[PDB]
Amino acid sequence: NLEQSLLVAILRQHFVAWEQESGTGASQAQIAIDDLLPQLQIYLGDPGSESKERTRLLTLLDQLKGHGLVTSPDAHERIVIRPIIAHLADPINLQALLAWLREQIAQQT
DNA sequence: ATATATATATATATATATATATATATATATATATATATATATATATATATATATATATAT
């Protein structure tokens, strides 16, 4: 669904950006939950409360863990991106949709 | 020119996944009400003594 696609695109670009610096296959840096909500806000707005957005992000991460793309949030609310994200079927789709929605919001604002 | 057997296109129906709302089961807390227990006071009945109304026995 749309939200899962956006989250996967964000995670994918984070992973590629990290690999650009530390090299291919470098141990992924732990990313906090607080860091992703501002970014999902860029494409989904504010659903009404922090208690709602954080819950949505957590359920999305748990859904993605089923496919193996991300680990479970650790005791301090940080996740790690799994290697399997690099081998998605068509990574070009993520870039296109993500940039398209970003351009949409930039045009409407 | 009609039947009779493939092939292709299209539509329908089903399965999977997720989001949202509702129902059910269970547990707990609360409030209310009922019933009971307790305490107190008063009423009734009986017993005993004295007072009022009436009559009889004993001693000389």
Task: State the nucleotide closest to A55 in CA–C1' terms.
Answer: B19
| Structural tokens at position A63 | 């859904």
Record the resolution, in angstroms. Answer: 3.2
Contacts for A9 with CB less than 8 Å, ≥ 6 apart: A94, A95, A97, A98
Amino acid occupying residue A99: A
| Structural tokens at position A101 | 């929605």
| Cβ-based contacts (< 7 Å) between A 37-56 and strand B | 56
């870039």: which residue's tokens? A95
Task: Give the CA-to-C1' distance from A50 to B31 in angstroms.
Answer: 38
Give the C-alpha separation, A100 to A84, whole Å.
Answer: 25
Task: Give the CA-to-C1' distance from A37 to B57 in angstroms.
Answer: 128
Q: Which method resolved this structure?
A: cryo-EM
């208690």: which residue's tokens? A51
A39, with CB counted inside 10 A (0-12, 13-18, 19+), is middle
| Structural tokens at position A86 | 């690099």
Give the C-alpha separation, A72 to A66, whole Å.
Answer: 10
Give the C-alpha separation, A70 to A58, whole Å.
Answer: 11
Task: Give the CA-to-C1' distance from A97 to B41 in angstroms.
Answer: 93
